[PDB]
Design a protein around this ligand. Sequence first.
Ligand code: 2BB
Ligand code: NI
Length: 164
Amino acid sequence: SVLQVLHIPDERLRKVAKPVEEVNAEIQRIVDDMFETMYAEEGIGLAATQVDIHQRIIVIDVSENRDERLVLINPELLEKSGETGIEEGCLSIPEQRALVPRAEKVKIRALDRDGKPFELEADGLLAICIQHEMDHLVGKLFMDYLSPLKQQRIRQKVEKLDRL
Ligand SMILES: CC(C)C[C@@H](C(=O)N[C@H](C(=O)N(C)C)C(C)(C)C)[C@H](O)C(=O)NO
Ligand code: NI
C-alpha cells in the first residue's frame, strides 16, 4: 500500500483537501496506506494531498523505529507562537532543501484514526512537521515561501530531472 507520491510540477499538488465527512473503514485504509507510503522512504510526515487523496488527512511518525503513529484528520490550528526555520526537504519536491519560516509552537484540534477528537500542543520538529503537512492540505508547498527567482530555479532543476 505504497501509494504513488506526487512530484512537482504536478497540478494536483495545488488542490485543496475537503473535510473528512466521517472516519469510517475506508478513511482508515487511506490512513494505513499513508503510513506505509511514508515508511517506504525517508520522511516523518505525509498529507493526503501528496498521494492524490484530497481529504484533510495527515499521518506523522517521527520515531526512529517507525512505531509511533500519529494521525491528524480535519486538523484545526488553535494557537501558535514564536518563529523558527529549518532546511526542509519535501517528498513532493525532488532533491531541494530550503529554510522556510514557521511558528515554533502550535496547538491543534483533530480527529484520530478512530474518529475521536483530541488536542495536541507541539514544538520543535513536530510543530514544523504539522504546519508543513497542513500547508499541503491547502495546496501549499514550502517553495511558496521563497522568492520568485528561487522558485523558478527549483522549477528549472526539476524539468531537467523529470525529463531524464
Ligand atoms: C520537512 C518535514 C517536516 C516533512 C518532510 C520530511 O520529513 N523531510 C525530511 C526533513 O526535511 N527533515 C527536517 C526531517 C527529510 C528530507 C530529511 C526526509 C516530509 O518528507 C514531507 O514532505 N511531508 O509532506
Ligand atoms: Ni512535504
